[PDB]
């Protein structure tokens, strides 16, 4: 029978073994000391939704928005990627900044959009983040949703807000519709057309969304887009 007295601090954090973590910290483990992957204990507590460990580590002076890992992200980024609304709320109550960008150029609303975490997207918008916030690559949450979430939400949720459906990203000028067409995201195409996506708006290479549909020889996408012109 394993009683966790031999587990190291990282593994005990991941699994939420509260008393093991506390005894190691009191025996001298610095809560700010990263592991060999440049990841802090707060990161592991956040991505495994360890609410109480998160309070404890922060009360011991853990840096709330410390960048770590290969993607160079805050603990709140990690929680957002993983989908823990309770952790996102908790970290933002202790002052975590949802607008910080990670090493892929994304702030939290973009991360929540691209991994389909609809209630986190709604929460960030409810807390004031702009629905059309651009990340470092010029992507909006709606573009990320079109590109990466082949599902009704979070796209349906984003369109309940005064979104500007025809913006293009900064370095391609691809609209959300362009992205949905590139990705073959047929669920999202109908929602964007119903929301007013212009099928002829051209990107930086002069291709419209309908041009991209023709290129892919997808009759369903060509038909749907043409009937909305």
């Amino acid at each position: 029978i394993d009683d966790y007295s031999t587990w190291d601090i990282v593994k005990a954090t991941q699994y939420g073994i509260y008393e093991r973590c506390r005894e190691l910290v009191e025996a001298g483990y610095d809560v700010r000391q990263p592991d060999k992957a440049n990841v802090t204990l707060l990161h592991w507590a956040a991505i495994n939704n360890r609410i109480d460990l998160v309070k404890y580590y922060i009360s011991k002076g853990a840096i709330v928005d410390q960048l770590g890992g290969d993607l160079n992200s805050t603990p709140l980024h990690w929680a957002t990627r993983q989908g823990h609304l309770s952790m996102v709320v908790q970290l933002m109550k202790y002052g975590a900044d949802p607008s910080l960008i990670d090493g892929e150029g994304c702030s939290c609303i973009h991360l929540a959009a691209q991994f389909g975490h609809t209630s986190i997207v709604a929460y960030l918008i409810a807390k004031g983040q702009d629905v059309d916030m651009m990340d470092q690559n010029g992507m909006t949450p709606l573009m990320w949703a079109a590109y990466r979430t082949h599902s009704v939400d979070p796209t349906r949720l984003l369109l309940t807000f005064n979104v500007s459906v025809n913006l293009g990203d900064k370095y391609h000028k691809n609209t959300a519709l362009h992205w949905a067409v590139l990705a073959g995201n047929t669920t999202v195409i109908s929602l964007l057309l119903e929301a007013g996506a212009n099928v002829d708006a051209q990107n930086i290479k002069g291709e419209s969304a309908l041009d991209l549909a023709k290129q892919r020889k997808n009759v369903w996408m060509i038909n749907h887009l043409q009937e909305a012109r």
Binding site: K11, Q14, V39, W44, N48, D70, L71
Partner: peptide, 10 residues
């Protein structure tokens, strides 16, 4: 399972 790997590039 728990999360024991850091987030990675897609």
């Amino acid at each position: 399972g728990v999360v024991a790997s850091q987030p990675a590039r897609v």
